[PDB]
Design an enzyme around this catalytic site. Sequence first.
Site, PDB file in Angstrom:
ATOM      1  N   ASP A  18       0.847  -1.180   0.000  1.00 13.13           N
ATOM      2  CA  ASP A  18       0.000   0.000   0.000  1.00 13.13           C
ATOM      3  C   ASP A  18       0.889   1.237   0.000  1.00 13.13           C
ATOM      4  O   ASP A  18       1.672   1.444   0.933  1.00 13.13           O
ATOM      5  CB  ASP A  18      -0.896  -0.012   1.238  1.00 13.13           C
TER       6      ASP A  18
ATOM      7  N   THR B 160      -3.693   3.150  -4.263  1.00 17.48           N
ATOM      8  CA  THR B 160      -2.856   4.063  -3.493  1.00 17.48           C
ATOM      9  C   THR B 160      -1.485   4.237  -4.130  1.00 17.48           C
ATOM     10  O   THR B 160      -0.870   5.302  -3.996  1.00 17.48           O
ATOM     11  CB  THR B 160      -2.709   3.560  -2.056  1.00 17.48           C
ATOM     12  N   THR B 161      -0.986   3.209  -4.815  1.00 15.42           N
ATOM     13  CA  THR B 161       0.279   3.326  -5.527  1.00 15.42           C
ATOM     14  C   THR B 161       0.109   3.931  -6.913  1.00 15.42           C
ATOM     15  O   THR B 161       1.020   4.611  -7.400  1.00 15.42           O
ATOM     16  CB  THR B 161       0.965   1.958  -5.637  1.00 15.42           C
TER      17      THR B 161
ATOM     18  N   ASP C   7      -9.352  -3.279   0.589  1.00 15.89           N
ATOM     19  CA  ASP C   7      -9.355  -3.066  -0.856  1.00 15.89           C
ATOM     20  C   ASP C   7     -10.253  -4.076  -1.565  1.00 15.89           C
ATOM     21  O   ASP C   7     -11.053  -3.703  -2.446  1.00 15.89           O
ATOM     22  CB  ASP C   7      -7.929  -3.117  -1.404  1.00 15.89           C
TER      23      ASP C   7
END
Length: 517
Positions: A49, A82-83, A380
């Site tokens: 994450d 998130t990345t 997620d």
Amino acid sequence: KSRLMGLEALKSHIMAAKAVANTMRTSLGPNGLDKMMVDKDGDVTVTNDGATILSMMDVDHQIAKLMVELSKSQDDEIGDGTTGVVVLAGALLEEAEQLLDRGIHPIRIADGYEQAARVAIEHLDKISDSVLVDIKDTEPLIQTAKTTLGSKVVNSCHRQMAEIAVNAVLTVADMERRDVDFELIKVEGKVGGRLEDTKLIKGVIVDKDFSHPQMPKKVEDAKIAILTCPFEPPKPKTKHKLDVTSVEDYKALQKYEKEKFEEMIQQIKETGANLAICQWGFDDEANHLLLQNNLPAVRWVGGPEIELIAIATGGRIVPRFSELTAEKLGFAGLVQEISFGTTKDKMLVIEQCKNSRAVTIFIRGGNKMIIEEAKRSLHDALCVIRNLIRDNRVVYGGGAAEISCALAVSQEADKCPTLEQYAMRAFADALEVIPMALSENSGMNPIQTMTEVRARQVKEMNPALGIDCLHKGTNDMKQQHVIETLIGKKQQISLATQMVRMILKIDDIRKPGESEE
């Protein structure tokens, strides 16, 4: 006096953005590489994450500080990506350097990036069809949960976590008019056990409530008395009023209160479900009166806590203490004790064998960092499926949706005769950083791999055929099981463009319009 001239002033931001993007680009998709970190306390954690690694690493740059919020806003609302948001923001900045070499004003390039982002976001409403078959959609959801947990946090890909996360949502959606709320699934994670310990909970876990450990703790049959009526005298941080005709009437009133305890006990006892769950609270003075008669009750129950058990069974809640029937009681299949950790405590788990309206994933860990990450893997997985079951708005990202948005931006660059047209083209190219990074971490040539998807974007509009992320070599997203929520991709682009505008706002104190040339 040291002055940073031109690209030098921006190079500080470029290098910091690359410093993070270099780790984010290797973590994209189901084939992303996990990041292992050792904390200041010697605690090793494994996460994929972007928000976790940015917050855990020591921040020494303005970009590294801003990137924490960039990824945090993605998992708080969407979950996954998130990345990806960081990689996209870094790509927009990396292309901004080239725009400066064109001689385009730093502010004008920032303006072009915002314009391109608006079009790229709106174009996502047309990308990816809104028709999804329940059977065909179940499979990519299972594969997504397996890669979400098994490639990001836990190297053994827990079968229970990956399978329950999908079945917990699909099994409840059918009984709730094809919709899923947050009370139908729960992730229970506590430190004190071991990471390999995972259990299937058919219902929900409730913490035992006793005012004194000296009072006996009774557990009985699979029937829960979910009451909103006052089963024990209420005291919401205040005091009752006395209304008596005489001193003798006051003594009779004291006895009347005691009699009410006996009557409430007998009325429920004749109906069953001796464990009363009430939202009203009180002091311990009346709680020992019910426990002394061997009838446990839960006090100070919150709104969602009573609704969670009530929905888990699907029954009704008792509005009045005098009206007691089986339809207003919980319907449990098995009531058993589940250990908390290994030596700390015990929790009471109420499972349902008739209606699986509340499926709970029970995980343990020996480290606070790993338990939070295990919960994030489920966060997620559960967010993607929750949005796809509630609505059919899906985006096949990973190279298909990104290339389509790139075309929509490039078309405006040609339609607009203005100075920002080059900046918008830069945005369209930056959108390709995602498929590029996904193939860059793999053994495939990212340039040759993206060639086919780009050519397809010309051949057909709004393609759902991007690059593979399972290293199978088949350019698809329906067979590669790479699916994301439509709103999720919109959020990724919206957040990334905000980062660009903030860092390319060099020294303007007053907020300007998009001034002409």
